[PDB]
Design a protein around this ligand. Structure first.
Ligand SMILES: CCCCCCCCCCCCCC(=O)SCCNC(=O)CCNC(=O)[C@@H](O)C(C)(C)COP(=O)(O)O
Ligand code: SF4
Ligand code: SF4
Ligand code: FES
Ligand SMILES: [K+]
Ligand SMILES: [Zn+2]
Lengths: 48, 208, 90, 126, 114, 688, 86, 95
């Protein structure tokens, strides 16, 4: 990369991180979607 | 149709059609159909009472000499009343040729074991017991060969599910690998991929 | 050069268009050339008449032809964009 | 003789290894699947299909994946006639329901009907 | 309705084979509890054998019970010869599985299964 | 017979004169490729994909349009047929955009599939393509007109079936664009079906857009419940979530169409849902609870009731299983007071004979009639595919339609006789000219809509309309096989509730108000707490919290129509079963499961455990609720006519006004549609 | 405590329902004029046998098969159902 | 343009964040929720609208066969720009 540098981008990591597994910086998976079914919210006023 | 199309072998097609007529007329007691594929493979569809007389013929006859059993196969086709299709693949090293001997059974009718003709069949049809549930009569050691020892069901039957009914895990309470009913964290996603337009007009079946 | 319409202040369904009474008599003479039940056959002459009174066709001449001939307005829009004589711009 | 006579009903439920819950609580559906109205081809209406009732699919707590506990949720069987599917369901002890094949009734198509003299079937444009 | 049999000509020879297979299992159970060093009693394993034989008691087809006898001889052969481990023998005892709801109301409470 | 013999690839077939080449090849099981031909649209002949060689003829013919002549041998697989197909597919893929990955039609596209089948595998097109300006024809149909192959199924649908006449082709040549030519909003009641018959991704579904993809969707064949037509649908799901709703073909109901409510109300099915049982806490607020607590607090009050102390209201979306479940549960308490929201008059025969509350002719029988009299209904919005069938009979069979009621738009032209009910007295007395039009008609048809029966003179309107029907049928040239008297329902639960023997309308509850009220999905607001006593024990059982769930004391969260196998009976008497597409969300259960568990907690346990035992009970109560996709004919019009003459109920002077006048009132009718954001965008789009 | 509803099931075309059809063609109206507040649900179906369901108080339902009866036999069984109230 | 819930959890470019009373935040206890802080919806908004003198423009995303399938965009609407369906680059007819 000193002779032929990589083509720069605004989104490439300027700080390369090594393998973070076993550290508190490790990856934890999760569902990246929102909630599908919406529940009914009962009225906060009395019914009499 | 030269570069991208497979070349047709008419010489082998004529020779296999002639030898299929030969086998069909020597053994009319069991031969039900004889057909040759467009890529020149001969199939002799026989009756299941003639598994041994046909195969001993092709192994021993001087115009056949199918001394090798390459493969032995069942195929589950549930829309037939005889759902299992037992497929013998035979190799004549003398005449440099291959033949296919096809027959049928359901779950309850036994097929005669062909270890008296090809000892190679000893495991193959045993695998047909394990995967499909076809029983083979007068077999030396007929038992399971591939499934686990307490395995219920015959897996390559098409009504058997892809994942089974049970799954194993280690359990530290009983200090033992245990079986439980199968639950998948992600279900196998079923893809309906078949196009609704007819692909091959040569294979069109006539309607009702 | 386009064949969609956008409502400008000089071309809209609130642009004033009305035939003159001599043009209404000409329209009635046009309509009497065709069989009863096929008044839509007078779409091409009357709309051309709406180009002769006005010089061009705003989208009030097309709707007026659609109104006096009892045809849907899209069936007049199709004629006014199919044929090359109907000036849809001034 | 070499042939026995079994006049009983054909039942192989003890031989398939299927547990009891997935025999006597499942409802097989024998049906010709409808044409997808996204398309005009009819090659998927040619054969009969046997599927089962859908059971619960829930959310995986880790990834949101569709977790299932139904082994028969992906099992679709192909049959050439209705009676073959009915025989295969009865042989396996599956209680079934059958929907009849819905072929489209034949139409009356006339291109000249688009340009009639006195009928309402004229096309207003073409 | 004229079918080719497996071993039995009618149900009497079939019940004879069922009965001899039951004798072989009944004799084998103490050997199985000893050499697999199972934590069940001999009576508990014999009750499991009686349960596995009464589960298939509704069958009147001679070919189907011939195949049940054949598969029972296969399971017995996997038991006597030590081909099963302790785990395969104890899979008859569904011991890690929680007891399933039986009546309508508990099945209503847990979920959607009928 | 006058059948002529033609040949398809040598194989003979006998066809009626007027059969096309495409239909003749269809009769031997070959489907000729097509893009503009549709068997329910008119023949256009303008995509040229059906070009096929007739032998001894040096020209390909348009198989969709060319009728067969006697002795033709149709060469569907010959060399010039395949060359014509590849040439036409090449011209279709000349200017078509490379949008297949970003297109909602990928994998379910006709152009992809019969480009794989009947076209070449590469391009000779070395030019630049056209790009067509997109249109805004509403909040439902996403329009990407660059994908349009100009097949004019838009125009033929909107003209012939939708009756709108507002889609058409402007321009000329390669610049010819299908659209409205103006910023016009194509919102008919059947406006989503152009998403179906468009073979390409030019017209896609704007709610369904980008969310799914056809191969990964599971297809569950089910029933519409958004009206009483009983349209067969496919709920296509993906990983336990409903993705969209397609139509199924049924020749006698919905031919292959569905309404916009059916097609786009599936997102109210995922909002405002009842997921957990709710009980009133110490502050008088609904709080979440378990099933044991909720069923115990309902059953303790149910054990303290007897007679008229307990009653039930059945909502618009309840299956016959839960209806007979709650009927058996309240009959253990000796209570007959079980009601529906939609008022049907109990005067005369009432709900005893089925013939005086059914669409007795059929939905299909509209094709056999010659005069249809629509009384007090706006069937464009009450039963939109029934109105589509009236329009198809109007178009192809010269059907004469008259309307008694307010002059609503019905997408075709009718004889508006006026809106007063006294016209019903004028026709039955022969003083009106349409009475002779009815008498000289061979197959008359009188359709009394069930929204006119919501009035206080609904018994008198039913008596006058049945008086007209029996004046015609007993005297005029009607054979006896033909049925004249017909009732059009707007509620999917209504006919199944009347076959089980509910008392329609809530006058039995307004007469003597109970102290405990079950509400199976009862969201019409017909009985509120001012009609009940001071502390009535209101139980709501349903799947949405809309109207009855705020006033409830205990909420029993139930299953929706996509969440259970369930018997619904349409307006013509045909019973139909849904299928489980997804399961109910959260702790919600199937409805008769809830009623059966309540019966077991209360100690009045019901003789069923599985769905089959519920349906054995349902066959015990009336044996036609288990014979699915069957219209059982109902006789005895004369006996109900004799019973209807007993009470001389007066016709009111108020005009017959249906509650759904324009497209504004169509989209939100039940608790699923009112919770639907797509129906909200449709209302917001039509009110501006 | 009393009869609450009567359910008469029958066929349109079967001969065994014929007398039951003969009961409703001739004798239902003066039945219904005699019992105005009683639901007598006539349910015709395709191939069912004739049948007479009588729901009494507290969910009790008695059943009388009306197969191959005449109109007078259906009349006697139905008036026994009316006079029973059990 | 990453934002933050009242729980302190970062909201992704989808819009996903757990509720406060959701137990499944315990998977990030002692660890981190890996989110990507380059939101593409903001990064394609940063691109300028290309003024072209043609009526129909072609976009392949640049790079030739390293971009997307080449599409043609119509620029006859003057209120709306012509947005590419693949890369989001939006175009405008300059006249
Ligand atoms: C420690 C675990 C060991 C597990 C051992 C599992 C072995 C499983 C072997 C199962 C083999 C069978 O089920 S064969 C039984 C099928 N027989 C029939 O269907 C015929 C009915 N059989 C009977 O009724 C039997 O009680 C008798 C004894 C044959 C006759 O009794 P009936 O007289 O009144
Ligand atoms: S309409 Fe069909 S061919 Fe055109 S981009 Fe979409 S999937 Fe591809
Ligand atoms: S938008 Fe679709 S249905 Fe309409 S003309 Fe174009 S291809 Fe045909
Ligand atoms: S299908 Fe005949 S030309 Fe389009
Ligand atoms: K489409
Ligand atoms: Zn791009």
């Amino acid at each position: 990369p000193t002779v032929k540098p990589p083509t720069a981008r605004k989104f490439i990591w300027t700080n390369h991180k090594f393998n973070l597994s076993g550290t508190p910086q490790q990856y934890v998976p999760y569902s990246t979607t929102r909630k599908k079914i919406q529940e009914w919210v009962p009225p906060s006023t009395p019914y009499k | 149709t030269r570069p991208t199309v497979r070349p047709r072998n008419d010489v082998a097609h004529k020779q296999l059609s002639a030898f299929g007529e030969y086998v069909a007329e020597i053994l009319p007691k069991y031969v039900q159909q004889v057909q040759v594929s467009c890529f020149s493979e001969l199939e002799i569809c026989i009756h299941p009472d003639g598994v041994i007389p046909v195969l001993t013929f092709l192994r021993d006859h001087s115009n056949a000499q199918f001394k090798s059993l390459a493969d032995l196969t069942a195929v589950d086709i549930p829309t037939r009343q005889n759902r299992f299709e037992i497929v013998y693949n035979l190799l004549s090293l003398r005449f440099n040729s291959r033949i296919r001997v096809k027959t049928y059974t359901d779950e309850l009718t036994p097929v005669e074991s062909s270890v008296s003709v090809y000892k190679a069949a000893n495991w193959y049809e045993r695998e047909i017991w394990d995967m499909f549930g076809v029983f083979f009569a007068n077999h030396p050691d007929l038992r399971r060969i591939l499934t686990d020892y307490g395995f219920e069901g015959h897996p390559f039957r098409k009504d058997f599910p892809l994942s089974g009914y049970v799954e194993l895990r280690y359990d530290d309470e009983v200090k033992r690998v245990v079986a439980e009913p199968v639950e998948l964290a992600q279900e196998f996603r079923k893809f309906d991929l078949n196009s609704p337009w007819e692909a091959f007009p040569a294979y069109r079946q006539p309607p009702e | 050069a386009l064949f969609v319409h956008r409502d400008t202040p000089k071309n809209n369904p609130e642009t004033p268009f009305d035939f003159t009474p001599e043009n209404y008599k000409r329209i009635e003479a046009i309509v009497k050339n065709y069989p009863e039940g096929h008044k839509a056959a007078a779409v091409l002459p009357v709309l051309d008449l709406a180009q002769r009174q006005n010089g061009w066709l705003p989208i009030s001449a097309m709707n007026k032809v659609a109104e006096i001939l009892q045809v849907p307005p899209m069936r007049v829009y199709e004629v006014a964009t199919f044929y090359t004589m109907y000036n849809r711009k001034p | 003789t070499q042939l026995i006579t079994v006049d009983e009903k054909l039942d192989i439920t003890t031989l398939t290894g299927v547990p009891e819950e997935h025999i006597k609580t499942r409802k097989a559906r024998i049906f010709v699947p409808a044409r997808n109205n996204m398309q005009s081809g009819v090659n998927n209406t040619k054969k009969w299909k046997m599927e089962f009732d859908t059971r619960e699919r829930w959310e995986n707590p880790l990834m949101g994946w569709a977790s299932t506990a139904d082994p028969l949720s992906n099992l679709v069987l192909t049959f050439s006639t209705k009676e073959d599917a009915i025989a295969f369901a009865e042989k396996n002890g599956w209680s079934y329901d059958v929907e009849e094949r819905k072929v489209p009734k034949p139409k009356s198509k006339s291109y000249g009907a688009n340009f009639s003299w006195n009928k309402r079937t004229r096309v207003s444009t073409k | 309705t004229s079918v080719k049999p497996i071993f039995s000509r009618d149900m009497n020879e079939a019940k004879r084979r069922v009965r001899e297979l039951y004798r072989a299992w009944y004799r084998e159970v103490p050997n199985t509890v000893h050499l697999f060093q199972l934590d069940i009693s001999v009576k508990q394993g014999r009750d499991k054998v009686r349960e596995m034989f009464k589960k298939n008691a509704h069958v009147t087809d001679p070919r189907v019970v011939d195949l049940l006898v054949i598969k029972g001889k296969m399971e017995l052969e996997e038991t006597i010869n030590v081909w099963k481990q302790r785990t395969h023998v104890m899979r008859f005892f569904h011991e890690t599985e929680a007891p399933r709801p039986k009546d309508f109301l508990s099945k209503f409470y847990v979920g959607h299964d009928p | 017979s006058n059948l002529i013999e033609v040949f398809v690839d040598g194989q003979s077939v006998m066809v009626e004169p007027g059969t096309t080449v495409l239909q003749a090849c269809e009769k031997v099981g070959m489907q000729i490729p097509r893009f503009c031909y549709h068997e329910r649209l008119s023949v256009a002949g303008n995509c040229r994909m059906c070009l096929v060689e007739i032998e001894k003829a040096p020209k390909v013919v348009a198989a969709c349009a060319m009728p067969v002549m006697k002795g033709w041998n149709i060469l569907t697989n010959s060399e010039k047929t395949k060359k014509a197909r590849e040439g036409v597919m090449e011209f279709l893929l000349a200017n078509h955009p490379l949008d297949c990955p970003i297109c909602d039609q990928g994998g379910e596209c006709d152009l992809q599939d019969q480009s794989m089948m009947f076209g070449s595998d590469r391009s000779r097109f070395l030019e630049g393509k056209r790009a067509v300006e997109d249109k805004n024809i509403g909040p439902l149909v996403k329009t990407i007109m660059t994908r349009c192959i100009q097949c004019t199924r838009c125009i033929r649908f909107a003209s012939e079936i939708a009756g709108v006449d507002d889609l058409g082709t402007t321009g000329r040549g390669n610049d010819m664009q299908v659209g409205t030519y103006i910023e016009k909003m194509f919102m008919s009641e059947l406006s989503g079906n152009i998403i179906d018959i468009c073979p390409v991704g030019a017209l896609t579904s704007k709610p369904y857009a980008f969310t799914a993809r056809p191969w990964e969707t599971r297809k569950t064949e089910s029933i519409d419940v958004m009206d009483a037509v009983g349209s067969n649908i496919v709920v296509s799901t993906r990983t336990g979530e409903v993705m969209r709703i397609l139509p199924r073909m049924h020749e006698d109901i919905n031919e292959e169409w569905i309404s916009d409510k059916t097609r786009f109300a599936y997102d109210g099915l995922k909002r405002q849902r009842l997921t957990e049982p709710m009980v009133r806490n110490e502050k008088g607020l609904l709080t979440h609870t378990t099933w044991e607590d909720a069923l115990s607090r309902v059953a303790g009050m149910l054990q303290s009731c007897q007679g008229n102390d307990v009653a039930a209201i059945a909502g618009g979306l309840v299956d016959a299983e839960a209806l007979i479940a709650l009927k058996d549960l309240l009959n253990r308490v000796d209570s007959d007071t079980l009601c529906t929201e939609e008022v049907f008059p109990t005067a005369g025969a009432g709900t005893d004979l089925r013939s005086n509350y059914l669409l007795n002719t059929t939905i299909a029988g509209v094709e056999e009639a010659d005069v249809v009299l629509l009384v007090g209904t706006n069937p464009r919005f009450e039963a939109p595919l029934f109105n589509a069938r009236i329009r198809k009979s109007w178009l192809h069979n010269d059907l004469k339609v008259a309307l008694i009621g307010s002059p609503v738009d019905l997408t075709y032209r009718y004889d508006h006789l006026g809106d007063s009910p006294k016209i019903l007295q004028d026709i039955a007395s022969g003083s009106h000219p349409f009475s002779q039009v009815l008498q000289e008609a061979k197959k008359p048809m009188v359709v009394l809509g069930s929204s006119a029966l919501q009035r206080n003179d609904g018994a008198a309107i039913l008596a006058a309309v049945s008086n007209i029907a029996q004046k015609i049928r007993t005297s005029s040239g009607v054979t006896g096989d033909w049925k004249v008297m017909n009732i059009l329902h707007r509620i999917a639960s209504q006919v199944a509730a009347l076959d089980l023997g509910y008392k329609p309308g809530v006058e039995a509850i307004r007469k003597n108000p109970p102290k405990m009220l079950f509400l199976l999905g009862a969201d019409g607001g017909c009985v509120t707490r001012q009609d009940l006593p001071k502390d009535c024990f209101i139980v709501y059982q349903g799947h949405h919290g809309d109207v009855g769930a705020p006033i409830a004391d205990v909420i029993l969260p139930g299953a929706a129509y996509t969440e259970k196998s369930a018997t619904y009976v349409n307006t013509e008497g045909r019973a139909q079963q849904t299928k489980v597409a997804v399961m109910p969300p959260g702790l919600a259960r199937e409805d008769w499961k809830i009623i059966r568990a309540l019966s077991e907690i209360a100690g009045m346990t019901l003789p069923y455990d599985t769905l089959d035992q519920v349906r054995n009970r349902l066959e015990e109560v009336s044996p036609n609720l288990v014979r699915y996709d069957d219209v059982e004919g109902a006789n005895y019009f004369q006996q109900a006519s004799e019973l209807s003459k007993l009470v001389n109920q007066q016709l009111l002077a108020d005009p017959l006004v249906p509650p759904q006048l324009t497209i504004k009132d169509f989209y939100m009718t039940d608790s699923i549609s009112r919770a639907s954001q797509t129906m909200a965008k449709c209302v917001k789009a039509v009110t501006e | 405590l009393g009869l609450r509803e009567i359910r008469i099931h029958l066929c349109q075309r079967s001969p065994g329902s014929q007398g039951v059809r003969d009961f409703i063609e001739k004798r239902y109206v003066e039945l219904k004029k005699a019992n105005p507040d009683l639901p007598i649900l006539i349910r015709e179906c395709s191939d069912v046998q004739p049948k007479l369901w009588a729901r009494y108080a507290f969910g009790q339902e008695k059943n009388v098969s009306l197969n191959n009866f005449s109109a007078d036999q259906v009349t006697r069984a139905l008036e026994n159902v009316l006079s029973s109230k059990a | 343009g990453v934002r933050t819930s009242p729980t302190g959890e970062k909201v992704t470019h989808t819009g996903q964040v757990y509720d406060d009373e959701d137990y499944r935040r315990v998977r990030f206890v002692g660890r981190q929720k890996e989110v990507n802080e380059n939101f593409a919806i903001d990064l394609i908004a940063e691109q300028p609208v290309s003024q072209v003198g043609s009526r129909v423009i072609s976009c392949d995303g640049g790079g030739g066969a390293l971009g997307h399938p080449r599409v043609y965009i119509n620029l006859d609407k003057e209120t709306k720009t012509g947005t590419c369906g693949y890369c989001g680059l939006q175009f405008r007819q300059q006249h």
